[PDB]
Structures are given as structure tokens and as C-alpha cells.
Amino acid sequence: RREEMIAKIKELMLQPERIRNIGIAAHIDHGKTTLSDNLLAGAGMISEELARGITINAANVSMVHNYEGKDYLINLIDTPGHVDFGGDVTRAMRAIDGVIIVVDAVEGVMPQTETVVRQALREYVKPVLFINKVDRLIRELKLTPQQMMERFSKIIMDVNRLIQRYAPEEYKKKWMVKVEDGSVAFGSAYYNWALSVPFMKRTGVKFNEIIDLTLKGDNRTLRQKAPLHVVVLDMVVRHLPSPIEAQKYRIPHLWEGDISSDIGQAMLNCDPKGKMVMVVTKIIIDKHAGEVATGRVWSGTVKSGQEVYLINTKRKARIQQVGIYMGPERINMEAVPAGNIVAVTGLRDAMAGETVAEEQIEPFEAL
Ligand SMILES: Nc1nc2c(ncn2[C@@H]2O[C@H](COP(=O)(O)OP(=O)(O)O)[C@@H](O)[C@H]2O)c(=O)[nH]1
């Protein structure tokens, strides 16, 4: 039901501890797009009452996920795929608080894997690990359960070596990933299943059941018994931070202004009562709506009709319509508080990376 989901989005956007702003990153062909598309589909966000390629270069897609009796609003924000480095990559890392690092079970950790882990960690983005294509270990390589667990262990050790080496000093140990606490999951994005220790504890489901169904070709039972979106989004909710948790340590890194100032404090503490500061992540031109700027609200509350400064472009402006994402769709909202990803009209002169603020402040980017 559409009206129900819209109400749910409004409910959760008002509670910053229920939000997760994330991205997904991977070496080429390891499964970023398949995971992205199938999480969105599995969470039921593109059902007719409300798949391949829908997330490709999508500014944001949101998913509502229930975890231990509470609903969460997960924003899967665009991160550039298949590129080594660039301003676009850095900018997208700065927009997300958590990242799912996807590693192919066959190739393992590859040079581009190391690059994306580095790039995320450099901006205080907390990682979790999803080991993909486990169907290939089962069917094509015909590995034993012990051989597969040993393969996972090696991947995990390689990832943690990168975290130890590249995480900000304070998080070199804290952000290591482990199978035991479910900050690692493994599965097949393509066949819509995954497992983790917390999921297996909760349900009693065992890897051998998944192996059996896989070899039998019972793909319907497979994806229902160990759903990709349940296992992976459970991991997102438990282990990736809310914007209010993340901004307390991310904002001094991200913004070069005076953290002790009122606006600095409002961003540090994700305060919806402070002056509004947002950063534009992406702009598209819609034939009907005109320029639509997607962005993250760091502080304050963004409103339809709100007068703002475009800091990099050096102009005063007025936001026309504010929107928020429901799956891939923009839905109108007249006011949206800090912590959220929004889409706004009225800022045609803005560029990607633009700092948009109620007061003249230091920009997040030199632009
Ligand atoms: N066997 C298998 N193939 C997969 C899986 N996930 C993705 N693929 C395939 O691997 C290729 C690359 O996937 P894609 O999601 O586009 O990778 P990306 O480049 O990281 O975005 C495509 O042919 C996918 O269908 C998986 O779990 N198992």
C-alpha cells in the first residue's frame, strides 16, 4: 500500500536514530549493482502497489527495513562505480556514513577492493563486508563447507588488514569486521540469499541447507529461507551508524569551519533546530520538474520556500519544492529534518558538491 509506505517514510524521517545513510562499493564485476538492485527489490520498494539497473547511477534509493521490532529508513546513496578515483568518488564517500564492501568469493580481495576500502575509511565511513557469488563456490568450484569457510576467513583477514592500515587511528581496531557478530555476511546477490551468524542463530538455518537447495536448483525456497535483503539489511542496521551517531565524529573531518560555532555544533550533533546546512550530491534535469538537486541535510530543517545561500556559486536562492525518496521515487515533503537525504527544486545554479545553507558559512568543498 502506497499511502502506508509514505506515512512510514514520514514517521521514520523524524527519528534520526532510525536512519542509515549508506553506499555499496566493489571491485568491477564483484556485485555492487546486483546487490543494490536486489536489496531494493527484496525490501519491496519497487512493487507495483507503491529491477535490473534501477539503482545504476541513482542519486538515492530508500528502503524500509524492520529489525528487532523497529523500522529503519535506509538510504542507498549513489557512489561512482568502475572508476579508480576522482572528485565524484570522494564526494560520494563524504555523503555516506556506512558502506557495504562487496567481495567476490571467487576472486577475493582485489586491488580495486583495496582502493574503495581506502577511499571509504579516509572519510570516516564505517564498513561491513558482504562476500558475494557463493553460489559459484558451491556449483562451479564444488568446494566443501570447510573449504568455503576457509575461503571466507582469508577474505576477512585481507579486509581487516586494510582496515587496520587505513582506518582513522581511533577505529583501526573497532571497525574490523568479524563473522561472529554479523559484520560479515556471505551469499549470492544474484540468487537473492545470504547468511550471517546472527541470522543463523535467530532462525536455526544452516549453511548446509542452503548448499542442498543450491545443488537441487530450488531457487525459490533458497531465497525465502535465507533472504538476501533480510540478512544484509539486518547487518546494515546493527553495524552501520545512524547520522546522529556518525556526525559526532565525521563532521570535524568533513568540514573545515569552526566546530565550536553554533552552526558547527548543529552539524556535529545533527540538530534539526540549528540553521539549515545541506550538501548537494547530485543534480539531474527532469523534463517536468526541472533541476532536481539531491543532497544531505547535515543540520537544521529544509523547507519548501526556504531562502538559502549557494556558498560555492555565491548566490542567494530559494528552495521551491522539497522531496524525500521512497524507494527510487521522489515524494513531496514540506519540511525534512537533519539526517535525511532530500531532493529539492529551485536551485538551478547549484553544482554537484554545493554547500547550501541558511547562513554564509565555509563550504564543505572548494568549488
Ligand atoms: N554467479 C553469480 N553471479 C553474480 C552474482 N552477483 C552478480 N553476478 C554477476 O556478475 C556480473 C557483475 O555483476 P554486477 O552486479 O553488475 O557487478 P558490479 O560491476 O560490481 O556492479 C553480472 O553478470 C552478474 O549477473 C552472484 O551472486 N552469483
Q: Which residue has the cell 538559502?
A: 308
Gap from CA of 6 to ligand 1 centroid (Å): 32
- Among 249, 237, 244, which residue's Cα sits nearest to residue 340? 244
Tell whether ligand 1 has an atom less than 6 A from the beta carbon of residue 133: yes
Tell whether ligand 1 has an atom less than 6 A from the beta carbon of residue 108: no
Residue 165 corresponds to which amino acid? R
| Sequence-ordered list of residues with C-beta below 8 angstroms from that of 275, at least 6 positions apart, any chain | 262, 263, 266, 299, 300, 357, 358, 359
Return the number of other C-beta atoms located less than 10 Å from residue 3's C-beta: 7
Q: Which helix (H) or strand (E) holds 52?
A: none
Question: C-alpha grid cell for residue 145?
Answer: 563447507
Q: Which helix (H) or strand (E) holds 80?
A: none
Asked if residues 233 and 65 have their Cβ atoms less than 8 Å apart, the reply is yes
Q: How far apart are CA 18 and CA 366, in angstroms?
A: 32
Torsion of CA 342, 345, 346, 347, to 10 degrees: 60
| Sequence-ordered list of residues with C-beta below 8 angstroms from that of 64, at least 6 positions apart, any chain | 5, 8, 9, 12, 43, 45, 71, 72, 73, 74
| 60 assigned binding-site residue | no
Beta bridge partners of 38: none
Question: C-alpha grid cell for residue 142?
Answer: 564444488
Q: How far apart are CA 104 and CA 52, in angstroms?
A: 19
Question: Residues preceding discontinuities in the chain at C–N > 2.5 Å?
Answer: 50
Locate the domains of the chain by residue range: 1-242, 243-367
Q: Which CATH class is domain 1-242?
A: alpha beta
Beta bridge partners of 187: 194
- As a residue count, the chain comes to 367
What residue owns the CA closest to ligand 1's atom 23? 29
Give whole-number Cα distances, 124 to 163, 188, 290, 351, in Å.
Answer: 11, 28, 34, 24
Gap from CA of 336 to ligand 1 centroid (Å): 36
Torsion of CA 132, 183, 249, 74, to 10 degrees: 60
Tell whether ligand 1 has an atom less than 6 A from the beta carbon of residue 345: no
Q: Which helix (H) or strand (E) holds 6?
A: helix 2-13
Q: Please measure the distance between the N-terminal and C-terminal CA atoms of the chain and give it in whole angstroms.
A: 43
Asked if residues 12 and 70 have their Cβ atoms less than 8 Å apart, the reply is no
Gap from CA of 236 to ligand 1 centroid (Å): 21
Method for structure elucidation = X-ray
In the chain, DSSP finds a helix count (H) and a strand count (E) of: 12, 17
Q: What angle do CA 93, 98, 99 make, to 5 degrees?
A: 75
Tell whether ligand 1 has an atom less than 6 A from the beta carbon of residue 33: yes
Query: 353 burial class (0-12, 13-18, 19+ CB within 10 angstroms)?
Result: buried
Query: Hey, which of 30, 32, 34, 115 would you mutate to test ligand 1's pocket, going by the most ligand atoms within 8 Å of its Cβ?
Result: 34
Question: C-alpha grid cell for residue 217?
Answer: 536448483
**Chain-centre distance of CA 92, in angstroms?**
10
Beta bridge partners of 282: 294
Gap from CA of 101 to ligand 1 centroid (Å): 14
Tell whether ligand 1 has an atom less than 6 A from the beta carbon of residue 56: no
Residue 64 corresponds to which amino acid? V
Q: How far apart are CA 2 and CA 100, in angstroms?
A: 28
| Sequence-ordered list of residues with C-beta below 8 angstroms from that of 316, at least 6 positions apart, any chain | 307, 308, 309, 310
- Among 240, 328, 280, 238, which residue's Cα sits nearest to residue 36? 328
Question: C-alpha grid cell for residue 340?
Answer: 535525511
In ligand 1, which atom is closest to the CA atom of 36?
A: 15
| DSSP string over 19-42 | EEEEEEEESTTSSHHHHHHHHHHH
- Among 65, 73, 26, which residue's Cα sits nearest to residue 243? 73
The torsion angles phi and psi of 320, rounded to 5 degrees, stand at -90, -85
Asked if residues 327 and 46 have their Cβ atoms less than 8 Å apart, the reply is yes
> Helices 207-216 and 145-166: crossing angle, nearest 10°?
120
Buried b (16+ CB within 10 A) or exposed e, 246-261: bbebbbeebbebeeee
Tell whether ligand 1 has an atom less than 6 A from the beta carbon of residue 34: yes
Asked if residues 340 and 19 have their Cβ atoms less than 8 Å apart, the reply is yes
Tell whether ligand 1 has an atom less than 6 A from the beta carbon of residue 132: yes
Question: C-alpha grid cell for residue 148?
Answer: 568455503
